[PDB]
Amino acid sequence: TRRVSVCAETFNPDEEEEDVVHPKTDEQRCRLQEACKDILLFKNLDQEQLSQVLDAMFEKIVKTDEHVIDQGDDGDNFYVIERGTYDILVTKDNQTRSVGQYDNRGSFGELALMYNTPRAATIIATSEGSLWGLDRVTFRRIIVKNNAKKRKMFESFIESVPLFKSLEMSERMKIVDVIGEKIYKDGERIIAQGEKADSFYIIESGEVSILIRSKTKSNKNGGNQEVEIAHCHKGQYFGELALVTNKPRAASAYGVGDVKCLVMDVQAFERLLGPCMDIMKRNISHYEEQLVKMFGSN
Amino acid sequence: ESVKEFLAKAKEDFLKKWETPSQNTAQLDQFDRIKTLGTGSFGRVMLVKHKESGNHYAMKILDKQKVVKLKQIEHTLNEKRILQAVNFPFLVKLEFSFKDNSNLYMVMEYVAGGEMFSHLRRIGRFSEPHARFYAAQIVLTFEYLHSLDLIYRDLKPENLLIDQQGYIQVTDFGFAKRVKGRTWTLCGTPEYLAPEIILSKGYNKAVDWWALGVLIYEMAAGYPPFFADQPIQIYEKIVSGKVRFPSHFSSDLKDLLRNLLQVDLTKRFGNLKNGVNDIKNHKWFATTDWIAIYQRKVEAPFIPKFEEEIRVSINEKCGKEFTEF
């Protein structure tokens, strides 16, 4: 059967200009989180978006015998059960089957958060109950807006990194598409001297201390302690050498306070943009400068 | 290579027509009217013949007023601007455009051929050589389009026509959009949606290549890689990226498909360092003569088989907005 196209409502992703308040107790919110763990659209959302989304969920009180959703009807919301019992019914051809029930637990209508489509089953309350609802448009806008803000922010931290200045706009976006984020609590190790250099970091907040145990300096012995070679802050990057060589990490890196870094895998970087050395040479009048930065003194 | 030549000359030709859309070209009195095959569930498409030249075209009837409702009125005003600015052998053509109180009439080229969906479904599945033949045409079409920063976003058997020469002709630019950067509308066809679209991460050219992977798989299998009875399950499968290939699929094919149906953008063909060449140079396409396919010199494996009277309003209405057309 010919498959028809689907389409959600369009929206200007780029933040218009700051211009949904539904109260919830800790237990209620905590319970909403649990009920949403496995839903694919929610499953891998960051801490912030999940919060904004739960914030947006409005309460819907239902009296017994009431129809929450009716098969065939257009759908706009997704619902989480707060209280009550409900019977689920599904009509196939001329037959209607009371297929299952919900007892103060459950959720349904997830598809409605994607695009407008017919309700596939009918849900009726069998007691006074309460449901948390979420409108598609509200849900999509919260998410897009946030991801478009994150993208602009990632874009900036890549752009201000001089090593990537010769990169084209589209090349920076490929990075933004896949680049990761990590939070480190003060004092915890980010990079360990000796292990394999697979990625590089770009500090977006906090500070990082780079230490080296002065032994790999001669022929067997010495210092065997801790020495700080460098100390990076917001906007700086470290682990850059993984982009141009393949030797174990020279030194260790520890978070100086609370840290947030953008983490990029070197192999992914190469598959996407090719080797870093070529990028550094793209702009020939800065090739030397770049080289001295990467393999130079300071 | 000429590839660069072609695309360069192509972008030139496109930017020119893009920054100066060819508005209201021909006159309605130069075309008559024949059959009226354009119902379905939307729009009014009726066949028509020309005067002097006496050619056959497919005219889409879009009542200036009919608009404003529905789902959108830009996904069209934009659709028109693209069809008019583009030029490729495997792309349908906006022959003539015009409006006035009637307003917004599309005179599309007409190929008395068959639908890709009907052909594929009848015979079940295409042989790999035959599938590779159609695939090549779509790869080339996407390279052209992406060269102009345009994404199709609705690839599927249903949107592909087989002309009388047996070559593909792509139709319906409902979701076509020029995007340099990232876009976000959740649109397309369930079976063919990319993980990034389903999850609203933002996207661009990479979704077309993913769709191609789906399209190639279905042609050689008879059914799409993430099929299911419930839309929800389709998406969960799409997001997991796990694919099971039929026994008869060759090695080169499986490999190509594992690279097209990559949930990981750092590993998806078309999105990497070499772009479309990672695809063009794949072992599965080794026996493909790209120039030959472009000039339509290769022998296709299948040659397909081959009302009312509306009036204006004597007055222009919604022309206080559909100016650009």
From Swiss-Prot, chain A:
Tissue localization of expression: Four types of regulatory chains are found: I-alpha, I-beta, II-alpha, and II-beta. Their expression varies among tissues and is in some cases constitutive and in others inducible.
Keyword match Membrane: yes
Gene Ontology terms: cellular component: cAMP-dependent protein kinase complex; cytoplasm; cytosol; glutamatergic synapse; plasma membrane; synapse
Subcellular location: Cytoplasm; Cell membrane
Residues where Phosphoserine is found: S5, S252, S297
Modified sites of kind Phosphothreonine: T117
Alphabetized UniProt keyword annotations: Acetylation, cAMP, cAMP-binding, Cell membrane, Cytoplasm, Membrane, Nucleotide-binding, Phosphoprotein, Repeat
Residues involved in 3',5'-cyclic AMP 2 binding: 163-298
Gene Ontology terms for molecular function: cAMP binding; cAMP-dependent protein kinase regulator activity
Chain sites annotated for binding 3',5'-cyclic AMP 1: 41-162
UniProt-listed GO biological process terms: modulation of chemical synaptic transmission
Post-translational modification: Phosphorylated by the activated catalytic chain.
Subunit structure and binding partners: The inactive form of the enzyme is composed of two regulatory chains and two catalytic chains. Activation by cAMP produces two active catalytic monomers and a regulatory dimer that binds four cAMP molecules. Interacts with AKAP4. Interacts with CBFA2T3. Interacts with the phosphorylated form of PJA2. Interacts with MYRIP. This interaction may link PKA to components of the exocytosis machinery, thus facilitating exocytosis, including insulin release.
Role of this protein: Regulatory subunit of the cAMP-dependent protein kinases involved in cAMP signaling in cells. Type II regulatory chains mediate membrane association by binding to anchoring proteins, including the MAP2 kinase.
Family recorded in the similarity comment: Belongs to the cAMP-dependent kinase regulatory chain family.
Name under which the protein is recorded: cAMP-dependent protein kinase type II-alpha regulatory subunit
Taxonomic placement: Eukaryota, Metazoa, Chordata, Craniata, Vertebrata
Span within the parent record: 92 to 393 of 401
UniProtKB/Swiss-Prot annotation, chain B:
GO molecular function per UniProt: ATP binding; cAMP-dependent protein kinase activity; magnesium ion binding; manganese ion binding; protein domain specific binding; protein kinase A regulatory subunit binding; protein kinase activity; protein kinase binding
Domain of life: Eukaryota
Binding-site residues for ATP, renumbered to this chain: 37-45, 60, 109-115, 156-159
Disruption-associated phenotype: Frequent early postnatal lethality. Survivals are runted accompanied with mature sperm exhibiting defective forward motility.
Keyword presence, Secreted: no
Location of this chain's protein in the cell: Cytoplasm; Cell membrane; Nucleus; Mitochondrion
Effect seen on changing H75Q: Does not affect interaction with SMO
Reactions catalysed according to its record: L-seryl-[protein] + ATP = O-phospho-L-seryl-[protein] + ADP + H(+); L-threonyl-[protein] + ATP = O-phospho-L-threonyl-[protein] + ADP + H(+)
Keywords for this protein: ATP-binding, cAMP, Cell membrane, Cell projection, Cilium, Cytoplasm, Cytoplasmic vesicle, Flagellum, Kinase, Lipoprotein, Membrane, Mitochondrion, Myristate, Nucleotide-binding, Nucleus, Phosphoprotein, Serine/threonine-protein kinase, Transferase
One GO cellular component, as annotated: cytoplasm
GO BP, one annotated term: mesoderm formation
Post-translational modification: Autophosphorylated; phosphorylation is enhanced by vitamin K(2). Phosphorylated on threonine and serine residues. Phosphorylation on Thr-185 is required for full activity.
AGC-kinase C-terminal domain location: 286-325
Reported regulation of activity: Allosterically activated by various compounds, including ATP. Activated by cAMP; the nucleotide acts as a dynamic and allosteric activator by coupling the two lobes of apo PKA, enhancing the enzyme dynamics synchronously and priming it for catalysis.
Residue numbers carrying Phosphothreonine: T36, T183, T185
Sites bearing Phosphoserine, chain numbering: S127, S313
Protein topology in the membrane: Lipid-anchor
E.C. numbers: 2.7.11.11
Domain Protein kinase: 31-285
Principal cellular location given in the protein's record: cytoplasm
Documented effect of changing L193R: Reduced interaction with SMO
Residues annotated as the enzyme's active site: D154 (proton acceptor)
Oligomer status and interactors: A number of inactive tetrameric holoenzymes are produced by the combination of homo- or heterodimers of the different regulatory subunits associated with two catalytic subunits. Protein kinase A holoenzyme is comprised of two catalytic (C) and two regulatory (R) subunits which keep the enzyme in an inhibited state before activation by cyclic-AMP. cAMP causes the dissociation of the inactive holoenzyme into a dimer of regulatory subunits bound to four cAMP and two free monomeric catalytic subunits. The cAMP-dependent protein kinase catalytic subunit binds PJA2.
Family assignment from sequence similarity: Belongs to the protein kinase superfamily. AGC Ser/Thr protein kinase family. cAMP subfamily.
Protein name (database record): cAMP-dependent protein kinase catalytic subunit alpha
Provenance organism: Mus musculus
Gene behind the chain: Prkaca
